[PDB]
């Protein structure tokens, strides 16, 4: 035991390893693995065929639009004008309140990233018999603000970059959309649910019919045209942020309308029960926990002067169980700085107590204390299912 008298290192604690970092950085762990040198392995038939990469995903077409193309489209006719950003779109005509959308793989892999740049590629499969013949422009106009999105026609389109194509025998091509913008990268068209900071697209694609289709009588008047999107050779994305897209695995959504009334967050589930600071434990009040001084707090009801209010739950199944389900309540300040909720037998007693408390009365008053539910009614004391909504009954005083 030589003594080690020299001064100790002086380090600063932190509670946690970095969450953001994810590359050139060893990240220590409490492995639940047995061997400490063990690591997952891939037997030769279990080998990972797919090299996950933004480019390996971006370089896959997904059908994104399906133009119809009738014979009687005159030479000027528009077929589509989808924006020249990866977030090209095809809404599903669903019954859902919040409609789902198809995306190109580039349109999903690029939603995860704040910024993108480089060429896109729209393959066009002009589905036709070789006996169909026609010609169509597939132009690209840099710098079109949405007000200029209209006023377009194929002839203004010809002024800027475009590509004529001749449907005859070969019936497919692949226009490669240019990246023209003043910004070296380009910001996401959408965003995490936050409308400002949603820049619109750099430029717009167009596809007018330069020479109208001229079918034989024995073949169809109409030709389908599929528009596929693919990340180009130079397509690339940088900053990772919140995806602007969510999976359809669960399309439930919950509006936070303030009109319905409910206990403050973290104070539910609650059950009727005794509490020593209120009526000396003689009378019921909601509680979010068995321990002392754990009464549920409640939002202050907005009562205009000269009126009164008392609660009634929308669903009697979710009310906390006493001797009877507690569908009725009167919310009043406890004098401890928070609004306790006082369960009552019925809408009538609740209305009466409400008449008292807004009537210049107080909790200590005998006329009120008669209206409070006695402790013996506590019963099993089952908790309310979650944090159930309370409709606010209102009456003139």
């Amino acid at each position: 035991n030589p003594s080690y008298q020299q001064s100790p290192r002086h380090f600063v604690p932190t509670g946690m390893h970095s969450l953001a970092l994810g590359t050139n950085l060893v990240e220590p762990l409490h492995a639940l693995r047995l061997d400490a040198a063990g690591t997952t392995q891939h037997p030769v038939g279990c080998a990972p065929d797919e090299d996950m990469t933004v480019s390996s995903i971006a370089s896959r077409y997904g059908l994104i639009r399906r133009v119809q193309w009738k014979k009687d489209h005159a030479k000027g006719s528009l077929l589509l004008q989808l924006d020249a950003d990866p977030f090209v779109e095809q809404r599903i005509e669903g019954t859902n309140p919040i409609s789902l959308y198809w995306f190109a793989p580039v349109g999903v892999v690029s939603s995860m990233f704040m910024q993108w740049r480089g060429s896109l590629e729209y393959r066009f499969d002009i589905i036709a018999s070789q006996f169909h013949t026609g010609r169509l422009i597939v132009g690209y106009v840099p710098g079109l603000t949405a007000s200029l999105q209209l006023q377009m026609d194929y002839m203004k389109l010809k002024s800027s970059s475009y590509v004529v194509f001749d449907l005859q025998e070969s019936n497919s091509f692949t226009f490669e959309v240019p990246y023209v913008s003043y910004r070296p990268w380009w910001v996401r068209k959408y965003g995490g649910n936050y409308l400002p900071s949603s820049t619109d697209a750099p430029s717009t694609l167009f596809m007018y019919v330069q020479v109208p289709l001229i079918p034989m009588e024995a073949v169809s008047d109409t030709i389908d045209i599929n528009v596929y999107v693919r990340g180009g050779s130079s397509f690339e994305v940088c900053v990772p942020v919140q995806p602007s897209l969510g999976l359809n695995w669960n399309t439930d959504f919950i509006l936070r309308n303030d009109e319905e009334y409910r206990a403050k967050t973290g104070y539910a589930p609650y059950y009727a029960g005794v509490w020593h600071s209120f009526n000396n434990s003689n009378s019921l009040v909601f509680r979010w926990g068995s321990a002392s001084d754990q009464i549920a707090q409640w939002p202050t009801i907005s009562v205009p002067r000269g009126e009164l209010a008392f609660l009634r739950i929308k669903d009697g199944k979710q009310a906390a169980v006493g001797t009877q389900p507690w569908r009725t309540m009167v919310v009043w300040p406890s004098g401890h700085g928070y609004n306790i909720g006082i369960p009552t037998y019925n809408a009538e007693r609740a209305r009466q107590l409400a008449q008292h408390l807004y009537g210049g009365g107080s909790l200590t008053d005998e006329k009120a204390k008669q209206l409070f539910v006695p402790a013996n009614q506590q019963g099993p004391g089952k908790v309310s299912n979650g944090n159930p909504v309370w409709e606010v009954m209102r009456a003139p005083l």
Binding site: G15, M16, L19, A20, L21, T23, H30, L32, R33, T39, T40, P48, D49, M52, V54, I57, R60, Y61, I98, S99, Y101, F103, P105, V108, M112, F113, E121, V138, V163, S170, S172, T174, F175, P178, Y179, P184, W185, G191, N193, S234, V237, C238, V239, P240, Q242, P243, S244, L245, G246, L247, N248, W249, D252, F253, I254, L255, R256, G266, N387, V389
Partner: protein, 252 residues
């Protein structure tokens, strides 16, 4: 074919490659795997004691899979605002794009601060996930099977909340499979049920019921990331998305 390109109509003069931000920000974002390892919120809960728990009872148990837990908006009265609003995430969004996976996960559970009590964490490779329903965090009730209690053989670890209240993990790949399912799972084969979750982690406090009252309705957020060894396999196209900025406003 899908990736065929019949006749390119090039207009572009060649654009400078940026190396995915390597030439600007100093860091490539090319490999999507290295982004997969940024940590993500995985689940979230308010602890809810029901039965008078002993030292051994697990407080909650959740299956541990890359796909992400079935999304839990929460009850209409008390939404978990992030999943309600910031739908799903990144890692599940990319897990959407492939059909099989074979790899580790990491977790880094963040326990509530006010509590002092010790916390154990089992991993349970044995357990089968039983359909996409009940692929969610579960608040275990009264003990009736071995599911509700600490178990001897299963790999485990015990954070001391007093020293640092965020146990960090490395759930390993233990399955008798080539590689597990990765989309949502409805369980066709009875033996398909072993083919999804890496295991079935269980967190549990060692508090006696007298002290367990401090713990009630204290948040316990959870994180996860795919753990380096992860390797998704077969490509599968994205199911329809739902744009987030288009979600309804709260309305005043």
């Amino acid at each position: 074919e899908e990736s065929r390109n019949t006749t390119v109509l090039d207009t572009t003069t060649t654009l400078q490659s940026s190396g995915f931000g390597r030439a600007f920000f100093g860091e490539a974002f090319n490999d999507l795997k290295t982004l997969m390892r940024r940590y993500q919120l995985y689940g979230q809960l308010l602890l809810s004691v029901t039965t008078d728990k002993d030292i051994d009872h697990c407080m909650f148990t959740f299956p541990c899979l890359p796909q992400g837990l079935a999304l839990d908006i929460g009850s209409a009265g008390s939404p978990h605002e992030i999943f309600n609003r910031c739908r799903d995430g990144i890692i599940p969004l990319i897990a959407s794009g492939y059909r099989f996976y074979r790899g580790d996960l990491r977790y880094k559970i963040v326990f509530p601060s006010n509590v002092n009590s010790n916390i154990w964490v089992q991993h349970r490779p044995d357990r089968r996930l039983e359909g996409w329903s009940a692929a969610k965090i579960v608040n275990c009730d009264a003990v009736s099977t071995g599911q509700g209690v600490y178990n001897h053989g299963y790999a485990s670890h015990i954070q001391i909340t007093r020293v640092n209240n965020v146990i960090e993990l490395e759930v390993p790949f233990y399955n008798a499979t080539c590689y597990n399912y990765l989309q949502a799972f409805n369980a066709s084969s009875a033996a398909s049920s072993y083919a999804v979750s890496l295991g079935e982690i269980s967190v549990g406090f060692q508090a006696t019921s007298d002290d367990i009252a401090s713990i009630v309705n204290k948040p316990v957020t959870i994180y996860y990331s795919i753990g380096d060894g992860m390797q998704f396999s077969q490509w599968v196209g994205y199911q329809p998305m739902m744009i987030l900025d288009q979600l309804p406003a709260p309305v005043v």
